[PDB]
Design a protein around this motif. Structure first.
Motif, short mmCIF file in Angstrom:
data_model
loop_
_atom_site.label_atom_id
_atom_site.label_comp_id
_atom_site.label_asym_id
_atom_site.label_seq_id
_atom_site.Cartn_x
_atom_site.Cartn_y
_atom_site.Cartn_z
N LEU A 27 -0.46 4.46 7.86
CA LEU A 27 -0.87 5.86 8.03
C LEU A 27 -0.34 6.75 6.90
N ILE A 28 0.92 6.55 6.51
CA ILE A 28 1.47 7.35 5.42
C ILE A 28 0.72 7.08 4.12
N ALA A 29 0.37 5.81 3.88
CA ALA A 29 -0.37 5.46 2.67
C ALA A 29 -1.76 6.07 2.66
N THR A 30 -2.43 6.10 3.82
CA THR A 30 -3.77 6.69 3.83
C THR A 30 -3.71 8.21 3.71
N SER A 31 -2.57 8.84 4.01
CA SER A 31 -2.40 10.24 3.62
C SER A 31 -2.16 10.38 2.11
N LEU A 32 -1.31 9.52 1.55
CA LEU A 32 -1.01 9.61 0.12
C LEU A 32 -2.24 9.33 -0.73
N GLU A 78 -1.22 22.46 -1.56
CA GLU A 78 -0.13 23.44 -1.58
C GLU A 78 0.86 23.13 -2.70
N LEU A 79 1.30 21.87 -2.80
CA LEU A 79 2.29 21.52 -3.81
C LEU A 79 1.73 21.63 -5.23
N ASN A 80 0.42 21.45 -5.41
CA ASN A 80 -0.19 21.67 -6.71
C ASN A 80 -0.37 23.15 -7.02
N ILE A 128 -7.51 13.07 10.48
CA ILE A 128 -6.42 14.04 10.55
C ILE A 128 -5.41 13.80 9.44
N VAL A 129 -5.00 12.54 9.25
CA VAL A 129 -3.99 12.27 8.22
C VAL A 129 -4.56 12.54 6.83
N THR A 130 -5.85 12.27 6.62
CA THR A 130 -6.47 12.61 5.35
C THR A 130 -6.45 14.12 5.11
N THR A 152 0.83 -1.20 0.00
CA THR A 152 0.00 0.00 0.00
C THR A 152 0.86 1.26 0.00
N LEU A 153 1.95 1.26 0.78
CA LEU A 153 2.83 2.43 0.78
C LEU A 153 3.47 2.65 -0.58
N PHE A 154 4.06 1.60 -1.16
CA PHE A 154 4.78 1.77 -2.42
C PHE A 154 3.85 2.21 -3.54
N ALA A 211 0.82 3.76 -3.28
CA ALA A 211 0.36 5.12 -3.06
C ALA A 211 1.46 6.13 -3.33
N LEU A 212 2.72 5.75 -3.11
CA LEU A 212 3.83 6.66 -3.39
C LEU A 212 4.08 6.79 -4.89
N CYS A 213 3.92 5.70 -5.64
CA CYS A 213 4.02 5.78 -7.09
C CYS A 213 2.88 6.59 -7.70
N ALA A 214 1.69 6.52 -7.10
CA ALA A 214 0.51 7.13 -7.72
C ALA A 214 0.56 8.65 -7.75
N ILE A 215 1.30 9.28 -6.84
CA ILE A 215 1.19 10.73 -6.66
C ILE A 215 1.91 11.54 -7.73
N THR A 216 2.66 10.91 -8.63
CA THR A 216 3.38 11.64 -9.67
C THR A 216 2.99 11.20 -11.07
N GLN A 247 15.93 13.55 -7.07
CA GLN A 247 16.02 12.10 -7.23
C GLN A 247 14.81 11.39 -6.64
N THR A 248 14.19 11.97 -5.61
CA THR A 248 12.98 11.38 -5.03
C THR A 248 11.83 11.39 -6.03
N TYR A 249 11.67 12.50 -6.76
CA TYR A 249 10.65 12.55 -7.80
C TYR A 249 10.92 11.51 -8.88
N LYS A 250 12.18 11.35 -9.28
CA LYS A 250 12.52 10.36 -10.29
C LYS A 250 12.21 8.95 -9.81
C1 LIG Z 1 1.28 15.30 13.82
C2 LIG Z 1 1.84 13.91 14.14
C3 LIG Z 1 2.26 13.14 12.87
C4 LIG Z 1 3.69 13.47 12.44
C5 LIG Z 1 3.93 13.20 10.94
C6 LIG Z 1 5.30 13.72 10.44
C7 LIG Z 1 5.51 15.23 10.76
C8 LIG Z 1 5.99 16.03 9.50
C9 LIG Z 1 4.80 16.59 8.69
C10 LIG Z 1 5.08 16.62 7.17
C11 LIG Z 1 6.00 15.47 6.72
C12 LIG Z 1 6.10 15.36 5.18
C13 LIG Z 1 5.77 16.69 4.46
C14 LIG Z 1 5.79 16.55 2.92
C15 LIG Z 1 7.09 15.90 2.40
C16 LIG Z 1 7.74 16.72 1.27
C17 LIG Z 1 6.88 16.72 0.01
C18 LIG Z 1 7.69 17.08 -1.25
O1 LIG Z 1 7.27 16.80 -2.32
O2 LIG Z 1 8.95 17.75 -1.13
C19 LIG Z 1 9.51 18.13 -2.37
C20 LIG Z 1 10.76 17.26 -2.64
C21 LIG Z 1 10.90 17.01 -4.13
O3 LIG Z 1 10.03 17.88 -4.83
P1 LIG Z 1 10.24 18.09 -6.46
O4 LIG Z 1 11.26 17.11 -6.98
O5 LIG Z 1 10.74 19.49 -6.71
O6 LIG Z 1 8.80 17.88 -7.24
C22 LIG Z 1 8.81 17.65 -8.64
C23 LIG Z 1 7.82 18.64 -9.29
O7 LIG Z 1 7.16 19.33 -8.26
C24 LIG Z 1 6.73 17.91 -10.15
O8 LIG Z 1 5.46 18.28 -9.62
P2 LIG Z 1 4.23 17.15 -9.72
O9 LIG Z 1 3.00 17.81 -10.33
O10 LIG Z 1 4.67 16.01 -10.60
O11 LIG Z 1 3.85 16.60 -8.19
C25 LIG Z 1 4.87 16.01 -7.38
C26 LIG Z 1 4.16 15.26 -6.25
C27 LIG Z 1 5.13 14.33 -5.53
O12 LIG Z 1 6.45 14.85 -5.57
C28 LIG Z 1 7.42 13.90 -5.17
O13 LIG Z 1 7.74 13.03 -5.90
C29 LIG Z 1 8.07 13.99 -3.76
C30 LIG Z 1 7.62 12.84 -2.84
C31 LIG Z 1 7.34 13.32 -1.41
C32 LIG Z 1 6.07 12.68 -0.82
C33 LIG Z 1 6.34 11.25 -0.29
C34 LIG Z 1 5.82 11.05 1.16
C35 LIG Z 1 5.72 9.54 1.54
C36 LIG Z 1 6.89 9.10 2.43
C37 LIG Z 1 7.07 7.57 2.47
C38 LIG Z 1 8.53 7.16 2.80
C39 LIG Z 1 8.65 5.73 3.31
C40 LIG Z 1 10.13 5.32 3.57
C41 LIG Z 1 10.98 5.32 2.29
C42 LIG Z 1 12.49 5.12 2.59
C43 LIG Z 1 13.37 5.21 1.33
C44 LIG Z 1 14.70 4.46 1.50
C45 LIG Z 1 15.74 4.89 0.46
O14 LIG Z 1 3.63 16.18 -5.32
C46 LIG Z 1 2.49 15.68 -4.64
O15 LIG Z 1 1.61 15.17 -5.26
C47 LIG Z 1 2.39 15.77 -3.11
C48 LIG Z 1 3.35 14.79 -2.41
C49 LIG Z 1 2.76 14.23 -1.11
C50 LIG Z 1 2.03 15.31 -0.30
C51 LIG Z 1 1.22 14.71 0.86
C52 LIG Z 1 2.14 14.29 2.03
C53 LIG Z 1 1.53 13.15 2.86
C54 LIG Z 1 2.52 11.98 3.07
C55 LIG Z 1 3.64 12.34 4.08
C56 LIG Z 1 3.12 13.10 5.32
C57 LIG Z 1 2.26 12.19 6.24
C58 LIG Z 1 1.24 13.00 7.07
C59 LIG Z 1 0.67 12.18 8.24
C60 LIG Z 1 1.71 11.24 8.87
C61 LIG Z 1 1.07 10.15 9.71
C62 LIG Z 1 2.10 9.36 10.51
C63 LIG Z 1 1.70 9.22 11.98
O16 LIG Z 1 10.64 16.05 -1.95
C64 LIG Z 1 11.71 15.81 -1.05
O17 LIG Z 1 12.82 16.08 -1.37
C65 LIG Z 1 11.43 15.21 0.37
C66 LIG Z 1 10.74 13.84 0.30
C67 LIG Z 1 11.07 12.98 1.52
C68 LIG Z 1 12.01 11.81 1.15
C69 LIG Z 1 12.98 11.43 2.31
C70 LIG Z 1 13.75 10.12 2.01
C71 LIG Z 1 15.28 10.25 2.28
C72 LIG Z 1 16.04 10.93 1.11
C73 LIG Z 1 17.58 10.81 1.27
C74 LIG Z 1 18.02 9.40 1.73
C75 LIG Z 1 19.21 9.44 2.72
C76 LIG Z 1 20.28 8.35 2.42
C77 LIG Z 1 21.31 8.21 3.56
C78 LIG Z 1 22.35 7.09 3.30
C79 LIG Z 1 21.71 5.70 3.16
C80 LIG Z 1 22.72 4.63 2.68
C81 LIG Z 1 22.06 3.28 2.39
#
Ligand SMILES: CCCCCCCCCCCCCCCCCC(=O)OC[C@H](COP(=O)([O-])OCC(O)COP(=O)([O-])OC[C@@H](COC(=O)CCCCCCCCCCCCCCCCC)OC(=O)CCCCCCCCCCCCCCCCC)OC(=O)CCCCCCCCCCCCCCCCC
Ligand SMILES: CCCCCCCCCCCCCCCCCC(=O)OC[C@H](COP(=O)([O-])OCC(O)COP(=O)([O-])OC[C@@H](COC(=O)CCCCCCCCCCCCCCCCC)OC(=O)CCCCCCCCCCCCCCCCC)OC(=O)CCCCCCCCCCCCCCCCC
Ligand SMILES: CCCCCCCCCCCCCCCCC[C@@H](O)O[C@H](CO[C@H](O)CCCCCCCCCCCCCCC)COP(=O)(O)OCC[N+](C)(C)C
Ligand SMILES: CCCCCCCCCCCCCCCCC[C@@H](O)O[C@H](CO[C@H](O)CCCCCCCCCCCCCCC)COP(=O)(O)OCC[N+](C)(C)C
Ligand SMILES: CCCCCCCC/C=C\CCCCCCCC(=O)OC[C@H](COP(=O)(O)OCCN)OC(=O)CCCCCCC/C=C\CCCCCCCC
Ligand SMILES: CCCCCCCC/C=C\CCCCCCCC(=O)OC[C@H](COP(=O)(O)OCCN)OC(=O)CCCCCCC/C=C\CCCCCCCC
Ligand SMILES: N[C@@H](Cc1ccc(O)cc1)C(=O)O
Lengths: 606, 178, 64, 458, 175, 56, 52
Positions: free
Chosen positions: A413-418, A503-505, A492-494, A285-287, A289-294, A518-521
């Motif tokens: 939870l992350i998937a139900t937000s996505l 906002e991002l749109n 809340i997560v929804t 579900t996570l993977f 929902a994460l693929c679907a958003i782009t 690279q995350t978008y890719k």
């Molecule tokens: C209150 C209590 C609860 C606390 C919860 C947490 C508190 C924090 C609150 C907020 C947290 C998240 C906020 C939003 C995140 C940022 C969104 C974003 O897009 O930022 C822009 C930016 C890229 O934007 P862009 O490339 O310019 O967009 C292209 C154009 O805009 C093209 O435009 P477009 O039209 O094609 O659209 C692009 C599309 C998508 O654009 C993207 O492709 C970016 C993808 C970002 C969204 C993915 C989120 C899902 C995360 C799942 C990760 C699972 C683990 C994966 C581990 C990977 C392992 C390698 O935009 C969207 O549709 C919206 C994206 C999702 C928005 C909704 C967010 C909800 C999900 C996350 C928040 C959850 C809320 C409730 C939590 C409930 C938990 C209790 O994204 C990022 O850079 C950050 C993403 C986070 C990735 C971190 C992974 C680590 C990266 C480095 C790895 C380190 C390696 C170390 C060495 C290891 C050696 C082995």
């Protein structure tokens, strides 16, 4: 004689009549699709009665009508299980099929082979009913492979197009990987319990071992497109839109989940397989929902949404709540089929365009489609008191309040937000803003077939949750007491997903251009999973099957050892023996040698 | 698809093809029309900035750098027209395309329907049979001794000639056959 | 015609036994057989030893 | 059972006394009547066999094989008369005579009560097959194919003969009933090991076993259509029938003499299925398919359980029908385009729709879609192998994945895509070809309706 | 009905509760079942009555075949082919009858599991025990004979088991 | 006129005649294996007041 | 197909079912075990005299 059994059998039986009529003078006329659709509607209306009987008295049955063959101690008979799952799923599937067939009467109007298309749709429905109502594993396998083959034929409907044939073969390959586990489970059950029917399997397995359940889980992962075997479902969008709305979104792809729901008494007694199922569902579900958003193709977005909801169903099964998973199947069918039908309406209006980047402001130009898509998106996100609420909300609460893997909970939870995020993407890019389609405007949704089908599914998506929830016996213990914040977690997560996606749109309206991260890719290219897994193993397998199996072994070494060596040796000995000069001197000397040897070697020893 | 290719592409052709590809991918990135127009005007200015470079080596170096930048910054999922080689309806109607020679194998009862159509078909077949030898002779005359060097074909030049090798181009099935 | 002939009939006349050819043939034509033989023989020996000791849980095992 | 043997011997002079333009009609009609008569052998008992006389008997294992042989003769006649139109009357009569003699030898082979009579008939089947291949094959390779067909067989069967006569000097009889009732165990000595090998290798090379299979692609590709039909459908099953007969005297040596053959069968099943994925000739693909299915049958016979024996019987019958149908389907395209290359003629669904339906059904039965008897046999064998060892489900599982792939590959290559532009000589399907396909496929599903008729004596 | 013996295939006394309506609304199930009765059950009953009337005018019988007992394989000399043949046929018939006995017991088990619903784990204990006993006896008799089974191999298996049991008993006696 | 019809279609009785002859020969073969007729321990039976043999 | 479908029961399936029904009825009535682990009466078997 308690009409329950007769009505349950007649519902399935009358679906085959147009199949028998497919060689009459109705398959050659333009009245065949309406005939098939009317047959399906009558079947749904008839099947509504056993459901009422069950809702009144909880009546259930098994009917073993025909004895096929008997092994020494194993008897194989045509048997149908008419429990709650069958009598609840049949009307839902029939209702969805009725709506989708009426939709296809308008969507595929220009197809020269529309009669074959309807015949194909009905064959899939028959195979799915066989799968759902089966009482033994062989009948279930019949339904399994039948729906697989029907999906293969319907994905490659346009058989002159290479990508459709590739997608059909891909679906077959992944389903065969699952069928391996199905066959493993069948063999284990027959050799350990001496049965393939459900009753004896339940009686003889109080503490089920790992192997049959792991085989069942592999089969379910294949059929429901879980993370290991996920990519075939989005590629199945190569078929016509009605096929996507019926087979690959709401009815066939839940079959794997349904399988695990059938064997829930055995799964209830094995913790390791339950944990495996939960983790598989969470990652899926996570993977997805994460693929679907782009994604930019609307069918791809809806397919990834379907895959994510199947992952959520697998999570629900993993926390020992099978009845909630079945309820979610029933709830999801309605609004998922409606969403696919709305997408098809948009595609047909815009000259078969599927990219959301070329769909502008359809909110006013397509009012009814806009209303239906908005209601479907709200139901998919678990908005209160709609159809999706009564299953998804309870699933989230049950996941919160259980002794479970913490990472799986976080990914759920992350998937139900996505989910809300990609719903926002679809609505924002397809209906809001200014037009982006070509200037010759042919937008027209004023057709009674489309309107009526979508309206029926819309009434379902509004009221079915309440109606079905208030009419089933309680098979689970309710979570009466919970902290307020954990009671509001899904809402809340929804809401956060909605706001972040909005906002991002909205940032796309700015006059700023930046190269992608690279995350978008990673998101857009599906984790690179099809890029690597469809190139490396296939290349190595085909290259080895040519270079080693065919050439090195079959054409060279197997030839070299037995026949070529024999031919060489015989030819050399023939040359040695037959090449004599014909001089009596030489072989008379040979005669002398022979005489002396025969006098010493054999004659001296007597 | 219609024109015969050359042995190689020229520098101007490569520049124009890169310009079209870059504009298409930029439109894929810039979904909205006004933003696309703004950045397309910027791209056109960037393209015609180095339009008057007399040094060809520097021109090819600039083209190389531009292609490297394009490959880095390309849209992984660019918009494709539905009937283009990557589109969702690319070869959708190929299964409905039936070659005309199949009509020669229809049963006479099938041909009893459509009499006028088959009379016209007979007329076309007569025309092709009468024109073939003249087409072959014209190709024999116009071809250089060392064989043809391109895939371009000549037109008809005589009084009532037909352009050589015309039958399979003229009798294409259709774009939407059935 | 040339492609199909090269893929089918021209292969053996152009084959020479070399260290590469011999090693690859021996490996890919013998190694899997002995690998699977060892696996299956070990599994069946373990099962037989378990059966002799009378601890395999063969209840309801009627069909074979 | 002379009521079946004598009418075939009467087919012989009926063919040789027929008018020049009535040979096919008469042969087909009376072949179908003989098949209808042979249908009565399916009435079998639960305890023993039908012991007609001192010389012939019918079991629940041989009766479906006899029915398949008698049903295959008219189909072969129907498939052969197209490409033999230019032949002279005498040579056509000789071809029909070869087919009739082959049927007679097979019928007597499947019902012989003694092992030496069985051996004599099972070798006598060689001559008509070799003559058909080397006289009516189309290409120059047929001659080589014939040689590969002959010696591969004889190098296996000459030791068996010796073993047979040796056994008759030890026990005093080769009658199968006496052999079964007076069975004694085989001790573990070198002499017994070599007796086991002599008794097994001829049937192994007949199946054929992987590693001993090189004769089969040559013979089944170079043969005319009727030759390929009878080679794939019936002549491969001689090995399985003989093995199931002969294993009654080989216990308990088999318990460990089967290991190399089991390993060869499983791994080579994987290997031949993989080979089918890269094949340019359409007939060779079908031949390698036959090799994989026969490897499954060999595993079933070697593990020696009732479920494996039932699965082996069902699989042999189902494979015979399916492989014969596939060979006929490939022959239609070959007769249209005069080439066996698979990628030459493509998009044939657009030109020939009903033939495309036949192709789809044949490929569906090849991949063992349930509830076809192909699937029933395959599943019974897989269950028995799982009981033998739980790890077998790996290899068997892999096979199930590969088979479907290549099967669908074949279909997708021939029927789908776009038609080849320069091929303009694809005529509509004749009534004869459609009738041939139907007469292949309908008995398969009819047998699915009543599967206990092909499940054998177990 | 009377078609089968009710001791070989027993069933519980079938207690079902009486309707207890608590609402003024009508029951759609009762209305639909009345319609189903009047529209389906009556024409089928009339057709069956006609068919049974026709059947009663032509009443003929078939009989269950009786087999006497012949000497077993234990009473046969080593090479006496005729006695061995008769004993082997008798043994095969007994094998088929034993398979059908196991089939009857399995039918009972499956029916009980379906009948008891949510209480099957406790309410099907007796059927499970009967199946366990029958399965153990059948496995002792016939398992592992393999293909090419016969009465002689069954006798050898029984002799081996008897020898093992006698040795175990004598060794436990010495304890 | 039946002369030409007979001389053209007399080959159509060979196979039915062979079937009848095979049936006759099978009955003759059965006639030579009556050494245990009404003599097996399982099927031994007292003769009816009319019938001579239990089977033919 | 019609001839094969109506072939008489020479496999004795119905006979075996009826015989098993009679056996089960008798054994359940008299309280005997439904099946015995021995298919041959031990009084007709003579084991070897000495096992040591
Ligand atoms: C209150 C209590 C609860 C606390 C919860 C947490 C508190 C924090 C609150 C907020 C947290 C998240 C906020 C939003 C995140 C940022 C969104 C974003 O897009 O930022 C822009 C930016 C890229 O934007 P862009 O490339 O310019 O967009 C292209 C154009 O805009 C093209 O435009 P477009 O039209 O094609 O659209 C692009 C599309 C998508 O654009 C993207 O492709 C970016 C993808 C970002 C969204 C993915 C989120 C899902 C995360 C799942 C990760 C699972 C683990 C994966 C581990 C990977 C392992 C390698 O935009 C969207 O549709 C919206 C994206 C999702 C928005 C909704 C967010 C909800 C999900 C996350 C928040 C959850 C809320 C409730 C939590 C409930 C938990 C209790 O994204 C990022 O850079 C950050 C993403 C986070 C990735 C971190 C992974 C680590 C990266 C480095 C790895 C380190 C390696 C170390 C060495 C290891 C050696 C082995
Ligand atoms: C399941 C429904 C039951 C319906 C009840 C009545 C069924 C009567 C069928 C009788 C047997 C079929 C005859 C075989 C030859 C095919 C006919 C032909 O040449 O076409 C000319 C004819 C003329 O049409 P056209 O306009 O000239 O177009 C011809 C074009 O070439 C293009 O034509 P097309 O595009 O329309 O395609 C032709 C068609 C025909 O091609 C076929 O595939 C038909 C052959 C069956 C597949 C064979 C391999 C599969 C192994 C399973 C064996 C099952 C046999 C059971 C016993 C059968 C007794 C004989 O293929 C298909 O439409 C798709 C095939 C995918 C089938 C997937 C289902 C798998 C098994 C599912 C359940 C099976 C067991 C049922 C019980 C299970 C427990 C409750 O075509 C038709 O009329 C349509 C054929 C009807 C489709 C039948 C498919 C379902 C029946 C499966 C077995 C029947 C079971 C009956 C027991 C009651 C249940
Ligand atoms: C291309 C495919 C062709 C078809 C495949 C046919 C397969 C045939 C393989 C034969 C299987 C086994 C044959 C004999 C059984 C055991 C063989 C031996 O290796 O086992 C040990 C034998 O010990 C040693 O290995 C001695 C044998 C060594 C000499 C044999 C030569 C094998 C080398 C490989 C040559 C390739 C042969 C095939 C040519 C094509 C067991 O120890 P032991 O208990 O004491 O012997 C048992 C017999 N007793 C009881 C009478 C004493
Ligand atoms: C082109 C259009 C196609 C679609 C339109 C079709 C229209 C409808 C027709 C389709 C019918 C659907 C089939 C559903 C099954 C109904 C029939 C079934 O019930 O009969 C079976 C009977 O089927 C037959 O037994 C199987 C047929 C036998 C197959 C032999 C084939 C003939 C020989 C041909 C050559 C052999 C080659 C193969 C060699 C092995 C059941 O047998 P059984 O349960 O017992 O009966 C118990 C009661 N009895 C015993 C008193 C009779
Ligand atoms: C057409 C409509 C005809 C209208 C008039 C007929 C009305 C009813 C006639 C009743 C006839 C008597 C009758 O049916 O009795 C049952 C009679 C005998 O009982 P058996 O179980 O077959 O005995 C065991 C031998 N196999 O069975 C029958 O012959 C009827 C069979 C109908 C079955 C329904 C169709 C299902 C079969 C489809 C193919 C399935 C392939 C294999 C599936 C495997 C599933 C595990
Ligand atoms: C100790 C003695 C052992 C005897 C074993 C003899 C095996 C029987 C087969 C004999 C094969 C003879 C072939 C030969 O030697 O000639 C080479 C021959 C030359 O061709 P010609 O036709 O002679 O020339 C025509 C053009 N001028 O080369 C070929 O290509 C031969 C083609 C056909 C060969 C087929 C052989 C197949 C063998 C399969 C295995 C059987 C081997 C027998 C022993 C098995 C081991 C126990
Ligand atoms: N060998 C089996 C064959 C069989 C299979 C299925 C049956 O229904 C009947 C017989 C006996 O018993």
């Amino acid at each position: 004689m308690n009409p329950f059994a007769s009505l349950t059998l007649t519902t399935l039986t009358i679906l085959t009549i147009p199949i028998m009529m497919s060689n009459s003078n109705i398959y050659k006329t333009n009245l065949y699709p309406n005939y098939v659709k009317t047959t399906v509607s009558y079947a749904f209306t008839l099947s509504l009665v056993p459901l009422l009987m069950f809702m009144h008295t909880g009546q259930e049955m098994i009917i073993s009508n025909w004895h096929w063959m008997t092994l020494q101690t194993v008897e194989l008979s045509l048997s149908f299980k008419m429990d709650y799952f069958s009598v609840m799923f049949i009307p839902v599937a029939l209702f969805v099929t009725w709506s989708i067939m009426e939709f296809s009467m308008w969507y595929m109007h220009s197809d020269p082979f529309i009669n074959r298309f309807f015949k194909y749709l009905l064959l899939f429905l028959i195979t799915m009913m066989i799968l759902v109502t089966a009482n033994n594993l062989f009948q279930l396998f019949i339904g399994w492979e039948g729906v697989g083959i029907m999906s293969f034929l319907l994905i490659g409907w346009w058989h002159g197009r290479t990508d459709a044939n590739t997608a059909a073969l891909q679906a077959i390959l992944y389903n065969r990987i699952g069928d391996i586990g199905f066959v493993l489970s069948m063999a284990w059950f027959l050799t350990h319990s001496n049965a393939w029917d459900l009753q004896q399997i339940f009686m003889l397995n109080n503490e089920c071992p790992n192997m049959p359940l792991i085989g069942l889980l592999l089969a379910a992962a294949g059929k429901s497109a879980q993370f290991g075997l996920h990519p075939w479902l989005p590629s199945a969008m190569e078929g016509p839109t009605p096929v996507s709305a019926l087979l690959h979104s709401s009815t066939m792809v839940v079959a794997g989940v349904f399988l695990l729901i059938r064997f829930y008494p055995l799964m209830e007694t094995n913790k390791l397989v339950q944990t495996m199922t939960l983790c598989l569902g969470a990652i899926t579900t996570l993977f997805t929902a994460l693929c679907a958003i782009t994604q930019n193709d609307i069918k791809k977005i809806v397919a990834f949404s379907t895959s994510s909801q199947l992952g959520l169903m697998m999570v629900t099964i993993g926390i020992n709540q099978p009845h909630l998973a079945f309820l979610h199947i029933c709830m999801h069918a309605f609004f998922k089929a409606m969403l696919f039908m709305c997408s098809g309406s948009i595609i047909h209006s815009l000259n078969d365009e599927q990219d959301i980047r070329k769909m502008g402001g359809l909110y006013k130009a397509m009012p009814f489609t806009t209303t239906a898509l908005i209601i479907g998106s709200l139901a998919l996100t678990g908005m209160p008191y709609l159809t999706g609420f009564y299953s998804k909300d309870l699933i989230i609460e049950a996941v919160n309040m259980s002794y479970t893997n913490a990472w799986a909970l976080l990914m759920t939870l992350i998937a139900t937000s996505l989910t809300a995020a990609y719903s926002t993407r679809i609505i924002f890019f397809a209906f809001l803003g200014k037009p982006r389609f070509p200037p010759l405007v042919l937008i027209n949704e004023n057709n009674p077939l489309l309107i009526n089908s979508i309206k029926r599914l819309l009434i379902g998506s509004i009221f079915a949750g309440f109606i079905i929830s208030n009419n089933i016996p309680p098979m689970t213990v309710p979570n009466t007491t919970m902290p307020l914040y954990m009671k509001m977690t899904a809402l809340i997560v929804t809401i956060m997903g909605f706001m972040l996606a909005l906002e991002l749109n909205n940032t796309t309206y700015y006059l700023k251009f930046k190269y992608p991260s690279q995350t978008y890719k990673f998101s857009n290219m599906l984790g690179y999973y099809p890029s690597i897994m469809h190139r490396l193993p296939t290349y190595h397998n085909l290259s080895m099957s040519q270079k080693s199996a065919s050439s090195l072994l079959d054409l060279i070494w197997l030839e070299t050892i037995l026949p070529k060596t024999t031919s060489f040796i015989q030819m050399k000995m023939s040359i040695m023996v037959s090449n004599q000069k014909g001089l009596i001197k030489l072989y008379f000397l040979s005669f002398l040698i022979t005489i002396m040897i025969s006098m010493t070697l054999f004659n001296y020893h007597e | 698809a219609f024109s015969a290719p050359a042995a190689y592409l020229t520098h101007q052709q490569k520049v124009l093809r890169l310009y079209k590809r870059a504009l298409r991918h930029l439109e894929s990135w810039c979904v909205h029309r006004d933003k696309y127009r703004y950045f397309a005007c910027l791209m056109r200015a960037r393209f015609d900035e180095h339009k008057n470079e007399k040094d060809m080596v520097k021109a090819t170096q600039l083209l190389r750098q531009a292609e490297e930048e394009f490959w880095y910054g390309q849209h992984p999922q660019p918009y494709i027209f539905p009937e283009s080689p990557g589109g969702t309806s690319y070869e959708r109607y190929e299964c409905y395309k039936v070659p005309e020679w199949c009509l020669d194998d229809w049963h006479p009862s099938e041909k009893a329907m459509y009499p006028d159509y088959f009379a016209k078909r007979e007329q076309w077949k007569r025309l092709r049979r009468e024109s073939w030898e003249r087409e072959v002779k014209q190709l024999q005359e116009e071809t250089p001794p060392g064989g043809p060097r391109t895939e371009a074909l000549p037109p008809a030049r005589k009084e009532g000639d037909l352009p050589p090798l015309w039958w399979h181009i003229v009798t294409r099935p259709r774009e939407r056959p059935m | 015609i040339r492609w199909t002939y090269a893929r089918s009939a021209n292969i053996y006349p152009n084959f020479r036994p070399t260290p590469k050819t011999s090693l690859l043939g021996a490996l890919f034509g013998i190694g899997p057989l002995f690998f699977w033989y060892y696996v299956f023989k070990t599994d069946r020996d373990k099962k037989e030893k378990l059966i002799q000791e009378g601890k395999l849980d063969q209840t309801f095992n009627i069909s074979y | 059972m002379l009521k079946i043997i004598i009418p075939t011997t009467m087919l012989l002079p009926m063919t040789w006394m027929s008018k020049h333009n009535m040979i096919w009609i008469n042969a087909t009609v009376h072949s179908l009547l003989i098949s209808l008569i042979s249908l009565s052998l399916l009435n079998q008992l639960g305890e023993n066999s039908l012991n007609f006389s001192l010389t012939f008997f019918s079991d629940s294992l041989s009766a479906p094989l006899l029915v398949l042989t008698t049903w295959l003769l008219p189909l072969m006649l129907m498939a052969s008369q197209s490409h033999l139109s230019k032949e002279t009357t005498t040579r056509k009569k000789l071809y029909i005579t070869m087919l009739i003699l082959l049927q007679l030898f097979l019928i007597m082979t499947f019902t012989a009560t003694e092992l030496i009579l069985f051996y004599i008939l099972f070798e006598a089947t060689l001559v008509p097959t070799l003559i058909i291949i080397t006289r009516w094959g189309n290409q120059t390779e047929r001659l080589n194919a014939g040689l590969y067909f002959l010696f591969y067989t004889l190098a296996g069967s000459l030791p068996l003969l010796v073993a047979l006569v040796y056994i008759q000097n030890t026990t005093g009889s080769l009658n199968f009933l006496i052999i079964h009732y007076w069975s004694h165990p085989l001790s573990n000595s070198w002499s017994n090991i070599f007796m086991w090998l002599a008794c097994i290798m001829a049937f192994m090379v007949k199946m054929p076993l992987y590693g001993l299979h090189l004769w089969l692609p040559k013979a089944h590709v170079e043969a005319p259509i009727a030759g390929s039909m009878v080679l794939a459908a019936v002549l491969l099953k001689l090995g399985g029938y003989g093995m199931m007969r002969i294993t009654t005297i080989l216990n308990p040596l088999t318990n460990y003499m089967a290991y190399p053959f089991l390993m060869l069968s499983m791994w080579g099943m994987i290997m031949t299925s993989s080979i089918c994925l890269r094949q340019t000739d359409l007939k060779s693909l079908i031949a390698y398919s036959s090799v994989s299915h026969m490897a499954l049958v060999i595993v079933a016979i070697m593990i020696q359980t009732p479920w494996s024996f039932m699965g082996a019987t069902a699989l042999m019958i189902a494979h015979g029908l399916t492989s014969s149908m596939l060979f006929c389907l490939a022959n239609t395209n070959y007769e249209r385009v005069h080439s066996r290359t698979m990628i030459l003629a493509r998009g044939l669904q657009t030109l020939l729709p009903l033939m495309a339906t036949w192709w789809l059904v044949a490929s569906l039965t090849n991949l063992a879609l349930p509830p076809s008897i192909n699937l029933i046999g395959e599943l019974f064998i897989i269950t028995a192998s799982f009981s033998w060892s739980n790890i077998t489900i790996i290899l068997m599982g892999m096979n199930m994945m590969i088979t479907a792939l290549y099967s669908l590959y074949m279909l997708i290559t021939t029927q789908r895509g776009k038609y080849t532009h320069h091929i303009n000589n694809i005529k509509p399907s004749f009534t004869r070809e459609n009738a041939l396909m139907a007469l292949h496929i309908l008995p398969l599903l009819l047998l699915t309706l009543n599967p206990k008729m092909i499940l054998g004596p177990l | 009905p009377d078609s089968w013996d009710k001791d070989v295939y027993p069933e519980p006394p079938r207690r079902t509760p009486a309707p207890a309506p608590q609402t003024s609304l009508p029951n759609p199930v009762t209305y639909l079942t009345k319609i189903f009765d009047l529209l389906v059950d009556r024409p089928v009953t009339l057709a069956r009555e006609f068919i049974e009337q026709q059947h009663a005018k032509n009443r003929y019988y078939y009989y269950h075949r009786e087999f006497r007992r012949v000497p077993d394989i234990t009473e046969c000399e080593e090479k006496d082919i005729l006695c061995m043949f008769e004993a082997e046929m008798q043994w095969r018939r007994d094998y088929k009858v034993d398979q059908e006995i196991v089939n009857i017991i399995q039918e009972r088990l499956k029916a009980c599991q379906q009948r008891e619903g949510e209480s099957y784990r406790q309410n099907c204990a007796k059927e499970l025990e009967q199946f366990t006993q029958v399965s153990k006896a059948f496995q002792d008799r016939y398992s592992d004979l393999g293909a090419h089974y016969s009465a002689r191999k069954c006798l050898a298996k029984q002799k081996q088991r008897m020898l093992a049991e006698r040795k175990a008993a004598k060794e436990a006696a010495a304890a | 006129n039946v002369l030409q019809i007979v001389r053209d279609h007399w080959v159509h009785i060979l196979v039915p005649v062979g079937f009848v002859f095979g049936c006759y020969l099978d009955r003759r073969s059965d006639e030579k294996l009556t050494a245990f007729r009404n003599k097996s321990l399982l099927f031994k039976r007292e003769l009816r007041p009319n019938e001579e043999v239990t089977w033919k | 197909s019609t001839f094969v479908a109506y072939l008489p029961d020479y496999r004795m399936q119905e006979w075996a079912r009826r015989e098993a029904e009679r056996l089960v009825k008798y054994r359940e009535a008299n309280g005997l075990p439904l099946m015995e682990s021995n298919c041959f009466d031990p009084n007709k078997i003579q084991l070897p005299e000495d096992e040591d």
